[PDB]
Design an enzyme around this catalytic site. Structure first.
Site, PDB file in Angstrom:
ATOM      1  N   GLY A 106       2.273   4.769   6.007  1.00  0.00           N
ATOM      2  CA  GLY A 106       3.395   5.551   6.510  1.00  0.00           C
ATOM      3  C   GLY A 106       4.677   4.904   7.001  1.00  0.00           C
ATOM      4  O   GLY A 106       4.513   3.773   7.682  1.00  0.00           O
ATOM      5  N   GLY A 143       6.638   5.550   9.511  1.00  0.00           N
ATOM      6  CA  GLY A 143       6.842   5.507  11.090  1.00  0.00           C
ATOM      7  C   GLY A 143       6.205   4.025  11.491  1.00  0.00           C
ATOM      8  O   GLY A 143       6.735   3.473  12.443  1.00  0.00           O
ATOM      9  N   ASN A 203       2.291  -5.495  12.939  1.00  0.00           N
ATOM     10  CA  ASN A 203       1.537  -4.355  11.917  1.00  0.00           C
ATOM     11  C   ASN A 203      -0.019  -4.444  11.361  1.00  0.00           C
ATOM     12  O   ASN A 203      -0.430  -4.010  10.786  1.00  0.00           O
ATOM     13  CB  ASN A 203       2.436  -4.037  10.605  1.00  0.00           C
ATOM     14  CG  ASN A 203       3.280  -3.061  10.886  1.00  0.00           C
ATOM     15  OD1 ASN A 203       4.449  -3.029  10.190  1.00  0.00           O
ATOM     16  ND2 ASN A 203       3.198  -2.064  11.862  1.00  0.00           N
ATOM     17  N   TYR A 204      -0.300  -5.810  12.063  1.00  0.00           N
ATOM     18  CA  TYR A 204      -1.928  -6.117  11.824  1.00  0.00           C
ATOM     19  C   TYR A 204      -2.241  -6.294  13.440  1.00  0.00           C
ATOM     20  O   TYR A 204      -2.564  -7.655  13.623  1.00  0.00           O
ATOM     21  CB  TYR A 204      -2.251  -7.287  10.965  1.00  0.00           C
ATOM     22  CG  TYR A 204      -1.919  -7.014   9.487  1.00  0.00           C
ATOM     23  CD1 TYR A 204      -2.191  -5.819   9.089  1.00  0.00           C
ATOM     24  CD2 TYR A 204      -1.464  -8.063   8.645  1.00  0.00           C
ATOM     25  CE1 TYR A 204      -2.030  -5.425   7.833  1.00  0.00           C
ATOM     26  CE2 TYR A 204      -1.595  -7.489   7.195  1.00  0.00           C
ATOM     27  CZ  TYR A 204      -1.565  -6.370   6.819  1.00  0.00           C
ATOM     28  OH  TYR A 204      -1.535  -5.716   5.501  1.00  0.00           O
ATOM     29  N   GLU A 253       6.122   2.976  18.767  1.00  0.00           N
ATOM     30  CA  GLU A 253       5.136   3.491  19.907  1.00  0.00           C
ATOM     31  C   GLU A 253       5.479   3.114  21.149  1.00  0.00           C
ATOM     32  O   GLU A 253       4.961   3.822  22.023  1.00  0.00           O
ATOM     33  CB  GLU A 253       3.724   3.213  19.437  1.00  0.00           C
ATOM     34  CG  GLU A 253       3.408   1.602  19.395  1.00  0.00           C
ATOM     35  CD  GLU A 253       3.620   0.959  17.928  1.00  0.00           C
ATOM     36  OE1 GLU A 253       4.550   1.470  17.056  1.00  0.00           O
ATOM     37  OE2 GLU A 253       2.787  -0.116  17.693  1.00  0.00           O
ATOM     38  N   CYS A 299       0.707  -1.317   0.008  1.00  0.00           N
ATOM     39  CA  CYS A 299       0.017   0.197   0.001  1.00  0.00           C
ATOM     40  C   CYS A 299       0.932   1.173  -0.171  1.00  0.00           C
ATOM     41  O   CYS A 299       1.474   1.559   1.101  1.00  0.00           O
ATOM     42  CB  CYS A 299      -1.031   0.073   1.337  1.00  0.00           C
ATOM     43  SG  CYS A 299      -1.893  -1.461   1.611  1.00  0.00           S
ATOM     44  N   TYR A 310       6.640  -5.524   5.102  1.00  0.00           N
ATOM     45  CA  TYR A 310       6.790  -6.213   4.089  1.00  0.00           C
ATOM     46  C   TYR A 310       5.953  -6.512   2.920  1.00  0.00           C
ATOM     47  O   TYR A 310       4.619  -6.323   3.313  1.00  0.00           O
ATOM     48  CB  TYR A 310       7.386  -7.746   4.305  1.00  0.00           C
ATOM     49  CG  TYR A 310       6.445  -8.501   5.221  1.00  0.00           C
ATOM     50  CD1 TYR A 310       5.647  -9.236   4.478  1.00  0.00           C
ATOM     51  CD2 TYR A 310       6.506  -8.593   6.659  1.00  0.00           C
ATOM     52  CE1 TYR A 310       4.544  -9.902   5.324  1.00  0.00           C
ATOM     53  CE2 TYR A 310       5.712  -9.387   7.308  1.00  0.00           C
ATOM     54  CZ  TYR A 310       4.628  -9.993   6.574  1.00  0.00           C
ATOM     55  OH  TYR A 310       3.730 -10.867   7.439  1.00  0.00           O
ATOM     56  N   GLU A 334       1.787 -16.939   4.657  1.00  0.00           N
ATOM     57  CA  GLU A 334       0.796 -16.223   5.366  1.00  0.00           C
ATOM     58  C   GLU A 334      -0.558 -15.989   4.988  1.00  0.00           C
ATOM     59  O   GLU A 334      -0.867 -16.176   3.820  1.00  0.00           O
ATOM     60  CB  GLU A 334       1.427 -14.843   5.838  1.00  0.00           C
ATOM     61  CG  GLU A 334       1.565 -13.877   4.726  1.00  0.00           C
ATOM     62  CD  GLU A 334       2.330 -12.677   5.129  1.00  0.00           C
ATOM     63  OE1 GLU A 334       2.926 -12.654   6.179  1.00  0.00           O
ATOM     64  OE2 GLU A 334       2.172 -11.510   4.365  1.00  0.00           O
TER      65      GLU A 334
HETATM   66  C1  FAD Z   1      -3.950   0.678   5.931  1.00  0.00           C
HETATM   67  C2  FAD Z   1      -3.307  -0.555   5.022  1.00  0.00           C
HETATM   68  C3  FAD Z   1      -2.209  -1.117   6.114  1.00  0.00           C
HETATM   69  C4  FAD Z   1      -1.227  -1.951   5.385  1.00  0.00           C
HETATM   70  C5  FAD Z   1      -1.511  -2.438   3.883  1.00  0.00           C
HETATM   71  N1  FAD Z   1      -0.422  -3.370   3.445  1.00  0.00           N
HETATM   72  C6  FAD Z   1       0.564  -3.854   4.299  1.00  0.00           C
HETATM   73  C7  FAD Z   1       1.511  -4.739   3.611  1.00  0.00           C
HETATM   74  O1  FAD Z   1       1.245  -5.204   2.387  1.00  0.00           O
HETATM   75  N2  FAD Z   1       2.497  -5.360   4.230  1.00  0.00           N
HETATM   76  C8  FAD Z   1       2.652  -5.208   5.730  1.00  0.00           C
HETATM   77  O2  FAD Z   1       3.640  -5.568   6.544  1.00  0.00           O
HETATM   78  N3  FAD Z   1       1.606  -3.893   6.161  1.00  0.00           N
HETATM   79  C9  FAD Z   1       0.554  -3.489   5.486  1.00  0.00           C
HETATM   80  N4  FAD Z   1      -0.282  -2.467   6.229  1.00  0.00           N
HETATM   81  C10 FAD Z   1      -0.209  -2.206   7.543  1.00  0.00           C
HETATM   82  C11 FAD Z   1       0.915  -1.241   8.207  1.00  0.00           C
HETATM   83  O3  FAD Z   1       2.129  -1.933   7.947  1.00  0.00           O
HETATM   84  C12 FAD Z   1       0.738  -1.046   9.455  1.00  0.00           C
HETATM   85  O4  FAD Z   1      -0.469  -0.566   9.493  1.00  0.00           O
HETATM   86  C13 FAD Z   1       1.553   0.055  10.003  1.00  0.00           C
HETATM   87  O5  FAD Z   1       1.761   0.039  11.456  1.00  0.00           O
HETATM   88  C14 FAD Z   1       1.043   1.490   9.652  1.00  0.00           C
HETATM   89  O6  FAD Z   1       1.809   2.371   9.901  1.00  0.00           O
HETATM   90  P1  FAD Z   1       1.323   3.985   9.732  1.00  0.00           P
HETATM   91  O7  FAD Z   1       0.901   4.077   7.843  1.00  0.00           O
HETATM   92  O8  FAD Z   1       2.270   5.192  10.181  1.00  0.00           O
HETATM   93  O9  FAD Z   1      -0.115   4.145  10.411  1.00  0.00           O
HETATM   94  P2  FAD Z   1      -0.461   4.756  11.846  1.00  0.00           P
HETATM   95  O10 FAD Z   1      -1.782   4.594  12.270  1.00  0.00           O
HETATM   96  O11 FAD Z   1       0.088   6.045  12.127  1.00  0.00           O
HETATM   97  O12 FAD Z   1       0.419   3.615  12.778  1.00  0.00           O
HETATM   98  C15 FAD Z   1       1.563   3.812  13.148  1.00  0.00           C
HETATM   99  C16 FAD Z   1       1.587   2.810  14.351  1.00  0.00           C
HETATM  100  O13 FAD Z   1       2.930   2.897  14.987  1.00  0.00           O
HETATM  101  C17 FAD Z   1       3.199   4.403  15.581  1.00  0.00           C
HETATM  102  N5  FAD Z   1       3.982   5.174  15.016  1.00  0.00           N
HETATM  103  C18 FAD Z   1       3.832   5.842  13.849  1.00  0.00           C
HETATM  104  N6  FAD Z   1       4.942   6.658  13.469  1.00  0.00           N
HETATM  105  C19 FAD Z   1       5.868   6.646  14.570  1.00  0.00           C
HETATM  106  C20 FAD Z   1       6.849   7.249  14.858  1.00  0.00           C
HETATM  107  N7  FAD Z   1       7.471   8.132  14.023  1.00  0.00           N
HETATM  108  N8  FAD Z   1       7.419   6.983  16.089  1.00  0.00           N
HETATM  109  C21 FAD Z   1       6.946   6.092  16.949  1.00  0.00           C
HETATM  110  N9  FAD Z   1       5.698   5.483  16.672  1.00  0.00           N
HETATM  111  C22 FAD Z   1       5.160   5.587  15.318  1.00  0.00           C
HETATM  112  C23 FAD Z   1       1.745   4.838  15.863  1.00  0.00           C
HETATM  113  O14 FAD Z   1       1.708   5.432  17.111  1.00  0.00           O
HETATM  114  C24 FAD Z   1       0.799   3.606  15.568  1.00  0.00           C
HETATM  115  O15 FAD Z   1       0.900   2.939  16.626  1.00  0.00           O
HETATM  116  C25 FAD Z   1      -2.453  -1.796   3.185  1.00  0.00           C
HETATM  117  C26 FAD Z   1      -3.269  -1.008   3.922  1.00  0.00           C
HETATM  118  C27 FAD Z   1      -4.595  -0.299   3.267  1.00  0.00           C
END
Ligand code: FAD
Ligand code: NAG
Ligand code: NAG
Ligand code: NAG
Ligand code: NAG
Ligand code: NAG
Ligand code: NAG
EC number: 1.21.3.7
Length: 502
Positions: free
Chosen positions: A149, A151, A440-441, A205, A145, A159, A399
């Site tokens: 983000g 972070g 991450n899920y 986090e 995706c 991955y 997975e």
């Molecule tokens: C929505 C969505 C998620 C996906 C998708 N496809 C993925 C894939 O193909 N492989 C994966 O491994 N993961 C996939 N993901 C999910 C994402 O990997 C996770 O959802 C991530 O954790 C999302 O990161 P982010 O985009 O930053 O979303 P936030 O809600 O802001 O979650 C962050 C998470 O961690 C903490 N956090 C963010 N940034 C920081 C920093 N800078 N420092 C400390 N902590 C941080 C936040 O508090 C929160 O807990 C496909 C789709 C559609």
């Protein structure tokens, strides 16, 4: 003395004169708050809102927020891309501020040394794009995706397509900049190896606010071959193919990823399996490979084009069917309400049991549920389990994701309960001691760590052990050391150790 205004004063104090702070009074509050909340499920009037949003653009801003929340007694939730499966980056039970990192998305590539400095608020999409602009034969290992983000993604492992070749984005991180509970800014050098290890897949986090990653780019073929073929035959014939896929997908060399989707099609109707490839190589080698290894799949030359990496990147993301600059577009795809859960698989699922899993797709509306299956061989067999906090390496076949997306706020309970029931149902067939899961899920179902509860350590372990391995101990060691008062905390975060056990 009140916290919103006390915060804002403290902040101003640390930092006099764009906008960096938002409160409910600001016209933009709502649409900022909202902008990046990815899971519509957590958009209600009932949903708690923070007293302040801050949008830092400088390490100095992050230090201030951390310091000021410490002083006034607010909790921080950092948001980078907003994709949390449980909204944990923008919701809290207690008075809180969200630190939205959207203003810190700078991406600096050194084409010659093949590294890049990517700030915490940039998105995969961007990272992919700007790497490719500098060099078509480069990229970085990461999720599918574009709007995820970095972070959340990197600090959680993260991955996708390149997994079998190079590992998780966390596996390819060289340095980072992190701000701790004392508002210091830390590079790897100053962080020390434990904390550098921790942030790479143990969840940022839990330890701080990451501000930047240093990233090491990986090689990528100027042409890869993709087919993606539809298969809506009778249910048994379908699993006959599944079973075969299941025993071989992870067995290919590094240059084949073969993945599979399942959903229902035909609105009032039949289960459909799609089978897709990224092949590092040409059309013919590939057909030949398929014709040899997996004849019954019956792919043909007519079936597959060869794309550049970035095209492949695009093909395999949330956008219909055009031009490569979507990668840049913060507001692409459609947001839905969603529930997702994921299992890892070490032993072939029995054909009988699998029909039953597929059978369950009929129990929701057409297209609502979907299973995604990705294979797990190649490089993951050689990366150590404690290399980084993410411990899911050798002897996994593939997975399994189970996911549901819908629109309507009422249909919530219904839909998340489906996802649960499939999860419950597959329990006998997936991994086992313990049932592994993926940070991450996030799945609060695995157990919650409460604000209004005394911190039992053996409680957190239950899920800590599912997300991480043996890795869990070292993780609580790092927590205890770097944030002993548990300031960086959430509804399922690593607790420090209480001090009579120090
Ligand atoms: C929505 C969505 C998620 C996906 C998708 N496809 C993925 C894939 O193909 N492989 C994966 O491994 N993961 C996939 N993901 C999910 C994402 O990997 C996770 O959802 C991530 O954790 C999302 O990161 P982010 O985009 O930053 O979303 P936030 O809600 O802001 O979650 C962050 C998470 O961690 C903490 N956090 C963010 N940034 C920081 C920093 N800078 N420092 C400390 N902590 C941080 C936040 O508090 C929160 O807990 C496909 C789709 C559609
Ligand atoms: C918040 O999000 C919902 C759905 O995206 C929408 O109904 C609402 O208009 C958004 N808030 C704004 C635009 O302030
Ligand atoms: C971070 O700190 C200060 C505050 O604005 C400034 O002097 C410095 O250059 C900043 N760096 C940036 C914006 O990259
Ligand atoms: C990338 O790879 C191909 C394959 O060898 C090569 O022919 C092409 O010229 C390369 N281009 C760049 C810019 O690296
Ligand atoms: C697939 O294999 C069969 C031989 O059994 C052959 O008839 C067919 O043409 C082969 N595919 C390709 C691409 O040549
Ligand atoms: C799933 O399992 C848990 C634990 O046994 C249980 O509490 C829950 O009700 C189950 N969900 C179902 C059957 O949908
Ligand atoms: C943690 O351990 C205690 C003491 O043996 C146990 O009884 C309790 O259930 C746990 N604590 C909490 C808060 O759940």
């Amino acid at each position: 003395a009140n916290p919103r205004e006390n915060f804002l004063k403290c902040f101003s104090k640390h930092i006099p004169n764009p906008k960096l702070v938002y409160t409910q009074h600001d016209q933009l509050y709502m649409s900022i708050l909202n902008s990046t909340i990815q899971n519509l499920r957590f958009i209600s009037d009932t949903t708690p809102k923070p007293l302040v949003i801050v949008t830092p653009s400088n390490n100095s801003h992050i230090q201030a927020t951390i310091l000021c929340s410490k002083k006034v007694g607010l909790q921080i939730r950092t948001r980078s891309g907003g994709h949390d499966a449980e909204g944990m980056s923008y919701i809290s039970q207690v008075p809180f501020v969200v630190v939205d990192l959207r203003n810190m998305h700078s991406i600096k590539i050194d084409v010659h040394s093949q590294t890049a400095w990517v700030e915490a608020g940039a998105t995969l999409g961007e990272v992919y794009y700007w790497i490719n602009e500098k060099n078509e034969n480069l990229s970085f290992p990461g999720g599918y995706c574009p709007t995820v983000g970095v972070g959340g993604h990197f600090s959680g492992g993260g991955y996708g397509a390149l997994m079998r070749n190079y590992g998780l984005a966390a596996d390819n991180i060289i340095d980072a900049h992190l701000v701790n509970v004392d508002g210091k800014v830390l590079d790897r050098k100053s962080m020390g190896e434990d904390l550098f290890w921790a942030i790479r897949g143990g969840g940022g986090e839990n330890f701080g606010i990451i501000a930047a990653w240093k990233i090491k780019l990986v090689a990528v073929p100027s042409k890869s071959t993709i087919f993606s073929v539809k298969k809506n035959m009778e249910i048994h014939g379908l699993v006959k193919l599944f079973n075969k896929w299941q025993n071989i997908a992870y067995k290919y060399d590094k240059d084949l990823v073969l993945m599979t989707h399942f959903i229902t099609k035909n609105i009032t109707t039949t289960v459909h399996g799609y089978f897709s490839s990224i092949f590092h190589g040409g059309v013919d080698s590939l057909v030949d490979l398929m014709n040899k290894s997996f004849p019954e799949l019956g792919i043909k030359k007519t079936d597959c084009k060869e794309f550049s990496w970035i095209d492949t990147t695009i093909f395999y993301s949330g956008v219909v069917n055009f031009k490569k600059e979507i990668l840049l577009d913060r507001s692409a795809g459609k947001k839905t309400a969603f529930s997702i859960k994921l299992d890892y698989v070490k032993k072939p699922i029995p054909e009988t049991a699998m029909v039953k899993i597929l059978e369950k797709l009929y129990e929701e509306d057409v297209g609502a549920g979907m299973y995604v299956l990705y294979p797990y061989g190649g490089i993951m067999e050689e990366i150590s389990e404690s290399a980084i906090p993410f411990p899911h390496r050798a002897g996994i076949m593939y997975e399994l994701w189970y996911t549901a997306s819908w629109e309507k706020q009422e249909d919530n309970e219904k839909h998340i309960n489906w996802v649960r029931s499939v999860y419950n149902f597959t329990t006998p067939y997936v991994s086992q001691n313990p049932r592994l899961a993926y940070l991450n899920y996030r799945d609060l179902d695995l157990g919650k760590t409460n604000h209004a509860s005394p911190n039992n350590y053996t409680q957190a372990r239950i899920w800590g052990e599912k997300y991480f391995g043996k890795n869990f101990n070292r993780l609580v060691k790092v927590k205890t050391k770097v944030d002993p008062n548990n300031f960086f905390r959430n509804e399922q975060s690593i607790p420090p150790l209480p001090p009579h056990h120090h």
